[PDB]
Amino acid sequence: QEEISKSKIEGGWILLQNIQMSLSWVKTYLHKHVEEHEKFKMFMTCHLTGDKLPAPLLQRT
Amino acid sequence: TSVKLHPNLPIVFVATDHGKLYAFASLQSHTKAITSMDVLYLVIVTASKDLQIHVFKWVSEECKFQQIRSLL
Amino acid sequence: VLKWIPRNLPSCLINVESSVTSVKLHPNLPIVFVATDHGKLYAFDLFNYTIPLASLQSHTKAITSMDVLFTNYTNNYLVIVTASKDLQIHVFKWVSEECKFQQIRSLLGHEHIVSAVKIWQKNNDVHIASCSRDQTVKIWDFHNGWSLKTFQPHSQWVRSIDVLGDYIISGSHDTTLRLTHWPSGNGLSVGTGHEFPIEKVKFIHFIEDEIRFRTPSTDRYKNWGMQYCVSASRDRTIKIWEIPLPTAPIPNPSNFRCVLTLKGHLSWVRDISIRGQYLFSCADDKSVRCWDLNTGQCLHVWEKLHTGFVNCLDLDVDFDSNVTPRQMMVTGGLDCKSNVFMR
Amino acid sequence: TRLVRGVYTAINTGPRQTLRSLIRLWAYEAWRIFADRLVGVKEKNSFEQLLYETVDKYLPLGNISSTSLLFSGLLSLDFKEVNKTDLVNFIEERFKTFCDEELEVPMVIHESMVDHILRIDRALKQVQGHMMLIGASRTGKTILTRFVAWLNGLKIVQPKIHRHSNLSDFDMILKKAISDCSLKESRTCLIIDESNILETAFLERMNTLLANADIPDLFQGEEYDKLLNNLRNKTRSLGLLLDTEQELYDWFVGEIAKNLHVVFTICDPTNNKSSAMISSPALFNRCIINWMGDWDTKTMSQVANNMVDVVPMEFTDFIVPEVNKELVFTEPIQTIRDAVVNILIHFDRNFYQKMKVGVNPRSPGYFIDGLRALVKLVTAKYQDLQENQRFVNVGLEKLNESVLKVNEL
Amino acid sequence: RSISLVKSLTFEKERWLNTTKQFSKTSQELIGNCIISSIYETYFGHLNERERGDMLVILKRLLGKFAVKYDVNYRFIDYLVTLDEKMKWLECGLDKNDYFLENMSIVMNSQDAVPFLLDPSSHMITVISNYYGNKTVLLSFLEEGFVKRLENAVRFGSVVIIQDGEFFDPIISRLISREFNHAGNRVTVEIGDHEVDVSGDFKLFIHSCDPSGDIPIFLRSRVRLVHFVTNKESIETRIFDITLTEENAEMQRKREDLIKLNTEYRLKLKNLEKRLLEELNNSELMVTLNNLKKEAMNIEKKLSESEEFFPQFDNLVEEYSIIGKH
Ligand SMILES: Nc1ncnc2c1ncn2[C@@H]1O[C@H](COP(=O)(O)OP(=O)(O)O)[C@@H](O)[C@H]1O
């Protein structure tokens, strides 16, 4: 959370590895963040055989 | 057109020549002129020149007029 | 003249637009006032009941209570007050010349609907008592038209009050009766014993004409002037209560006492009345009873007096010397028909 | 044993009984004990025939249907059989008073809901009498429970359970309710919904409350000592000579048992947590299972007729269609009102069949919403049509009058 | 002037006579049309076009079985969606789709039940935000302080849209179930642990951009669940609009301005006819009616002149039909 805020303010890439291990955080914080800098890109690495990621987050990326 | 009164209430049911019905609740039951009306819950039957008779019941709880059925 | 009992059948019927809530009698002229759930106020002659004398709609909601009074002075008209659910209390004037209703003023300040009002004369001054769902027992002067006292004596909302002298009592939704001194605004004793909200509570009055509950017991109670109270609730019971002697009265360390408990109604008891040794009460079982205070039993039962529920009834006040206790009885019902007993 | 206790209660609180009245009362008790848990209509008919056979072969009498037996102590001072129309009128007046006093809700009274009111009142008048209402959503479970508890003078306690809530808040509200039942001797009707059981530990707490008459977890240590002191002070105020811990706690348990009724509201009994709630060991053996189910077509016809009879509906000709008796759910068709009600019932059944609800109970919310929308829409449309037609007619009359005046001049 | 007044009202007299003739036919089919309208209102909020058509066929069969008359050319948009409401919805940002128009009319004519919006694209949030202007407020079930913000909004009277409908918070149940206690002229509702007042101008919307989520049975049985799912004709129209904007932006601007002017002129003509009827009913006046008739003739001539660009639009549609279908 702190690094996402810092990277949105001052710029910089960021990658979240294994987002399926924190599904509650993905369903609340990530949804409310992607729902609402220029050199800021965020990557998420999940698994095809894992749990179902939320649809509103998935279509926004 | 026609003048009617309640049996034991201080209400006068006066019918206009344009088809409106007034109680002194207003409702234009008849589009054309109304010939005559009769009284008899209280059942009021209105006849007009449009070959259609509408029977209305006067509800005294809310002082409104409700239609039960009509004869054509 | 006091032991009158109404006949088996009614003499005549009064037709009202909707359900009747309160009915009052003029002490002098044989004319009856009928309330209406639609908000209208009626006035029917006891002899010519085909058409009302006067009818007006001063309120926009249901009228809850009314009571009349013939004003007297030591130096003279009829004052009628109307309580309704429209947040306002309307005071009317009944002129006896042309027999029409004349609105005097409106009293505002209640935070919810008002359900009971009381009017009495003392030292050539007329006061209007009131109790509402705002849990406040308020009083408004008839001439000044300004509030005098206001207090919150019940946890729940008050439903009916009655005034004897400078003392007031009140029954509310929490099944308690509170006797509070009006000039000081403090409670004197509490009430417990009911399991359903009070519909009507009124003081019993001493008479000199032998009724058990209308005679004082000791000299201290004779000086106080009040000893018992009658309360009717939704428990299908009528209970005669007892007031302990208080020490600006100071409450003695504070509980009432049920001297006698009546029963026999098949539904909620709505309104009660007193005339001599007989107690007249109506209920939602479309029936009216008649209880003796000396025996506690019911002599006569008026089965199926109204098609629907029976809301209100009253008799002529016999404790007051200024009002002649005529044998006039009139009841109000939910079936849009008022019933009056003649001779 | 429940049947025997019910028969004793009805005889004790009843008038002078005859043999026919005794048989009818026993049949009513049999209906309330053995046949409130039945789901299908054919099982209800089978139970009715079983009662007929048993009565005819052991006690050699009117109709013994579920609705034809209306026993209630509301209309009198004693538990006796009452008529249908006067009971409906009394319930109408008291529900009008209830809507005036507590909350306004536009509900329309039919015979099946009168029967449900009677059985809920019978179950709430008992000692250790708990209910468990099962039926589709918007059938009227919680509002009927609140109305019946208001009739009996009970105090409604509905737990304010929402998301981000744990066992602490549920234990706090349960302890507060128990304190009101015992220390303040106020009668309480605690209504627990299916959605108020967020976790299975809530169900365990309810199970402990129902099996015993208290939760041993809610009074442990310092709070146990506080409960001891408070109830000792209450007993001193009441005026009973209790000093030992055992007798005082038995008084506590007896007061809770006398002054606490729990009513369960369940929408879909197929869900996992609802199935666990139904199949709970001491919820089954203590509660009175009352399966309301979905609305049968007679109830829908009655409520539809009672909500469309007030609108101006019949204004034109109508030919009576030649349709089968199985396709007519109302009375035989005489006006367009019965045809409208039958059309709405048919569309509700066909829509719920097409959506493949399966055996899940059918919510009558769509039926009521469509009825209210149709009433308001036909009122507005009729008003607009008659106003427009009057305007066009007077305009044409004015034009013709002007033309005639110009021709005369 | 009276002679010209009589002569100019020949078309008005003919239209009035035709409407008087068809009044009996429209009154015969009023009940069936109202029944189908209520069925649309309370049943087909959560159905796609195929299911809507199939259940409409079933409803028409069941309506004709009991021999009650209904309009054979009935249409929901022409019966419930008025021209002023349609203009407001299209100006606020609603799509040109008939499905979206039907769902819009379903949502904004539900004055009793709380409308539940299921819009994956999150377009109705900004459509309703444009509809109510600056008095709207956006809340969510997933944010802290939601309870006090909703209480303040109910006290003030603002229009509230609650996002994330699949995370329903059950202390607004009395707001959902419309179980209010009337206190004289004031209406109060108990939310949470303390009652709040209702201003009477407060409207509630629930939005959820997650299809196949989780709606509780208490919430599901008491809301007008309305599904905003994109369909074939919406895709075709959006593809055509995008390719025409990127191909000839000036022509696309001209066509949309022409469409807006044409519908504004039609609304003005309808309002002018209504004003003429009202003025003639409330019967100087001849000069005013002559001016109104001159304005109506000007509007009709404007439409006749503006109807000369339709073949180009039709040719472009026929050209890009293959791109749309692909
Ligand atoms: N007999 C009835 N007549 C009319 N409406 C009813 C009736 N019974 C239930 N309702 C509807 O159901 C709603 C209340 O149902 P409720 O008791 O909340 O259902 P549940 O207990 O499943 O939540 C009311 O809004 C009312 O419109």
Author numbering:
A (entry chain A): 3826 to 3861, 3868 to 3892
B (entry chain B): 159 to 182, 192 to 207, 219 to 250
C (entry chain C): 139 to 213, 218 to 351, 354 to 391, 397 to 402, 405 to 494
D (entry chain A): 2623 to 2682, 2686 to 3034
E (entry chain A): 3291 to 3573, 3582 to 3624
Passage from the reporting paper:
Cytoplasmic dynein-1 (dynein) is a highly conserved molecular motor that moves toward the microtubule minus end, transporting various cargoes including RNAs, membrane vesicles, and viruses, and plays a crucial role in cell division. Dynein belongs to the ATPase associated with various cellular activities (AAA+) family of proteins. Its heavy chain features a motor domain composed of six AAA+ modules, a long stalk, a microtubule-binding domain (MTBD) located at the end of the stalk, a buttress region that makes additional connections between the AAA5 module and the stalk, and a long tail that interacts with dynactin and an activating adapter. Lis1 is a dimer (~90 kDa) with an amino-terminal dimerization domain and carboxy-terminal β-propellers that bind to the dynein motor domain24,25. Our data support a model in which Lis1 relieves dynein autoinhibition by increasing its basal ATP hydrolysis rate and promoting conformations compatible with complex assembly and motility.
We also prepared grids with samples that were pre-incubated with Lis1 before ATP addition. Because some of our maps showed partial density for the Lis1 β-propellers, we performed 3D classifications without alignment in Relion to further resolve this compositional heterogeneity. This analysis distinguished states with no, one, or two Lis1 β-propellers bound to dynein. The nucleotide occupancies in these new maps correspond to the nucleotides observed in pre-3D classification maps. In addition, the interaction sites between Lis1 and dynein in our maps are those previously characterized and are largely the same in the bent and intermediate dynein states. We also saw clear density for the second Lis1 β-propeller in the intermediate state dynein, even though the nucleotide densities in this state are consistent with the ones in the straight linker dynein. Comparison of this state (I6, 3.4-Å resolution) with our straight linker dynein (I3, 4-Å resolution) bound to one Lis1 β-propeller showed that the sitering interactions are conserved while sitestalk is shifted away from Lis1 as dynein goes from the intermediate to the straight linker state (~15 Å), making it inaccessible for binding by the second Lis1 β-propeller. Binding of Lis1 at the second site is unlikely to happen without Lis1 bound at sitering. We next investigated the AAA3 and AAA4 contact area and showed that Lis1 binding loosens the AAA3 and AAA4 interface, potentially favoring ADP release from the AAA3 binding pocket. Notably, binding of the second Lis1 β-propeller further loosens the interface, as illustrated by comparing the population distributions of interm-2× Lis1 versus interm-1× Lis1 systems.
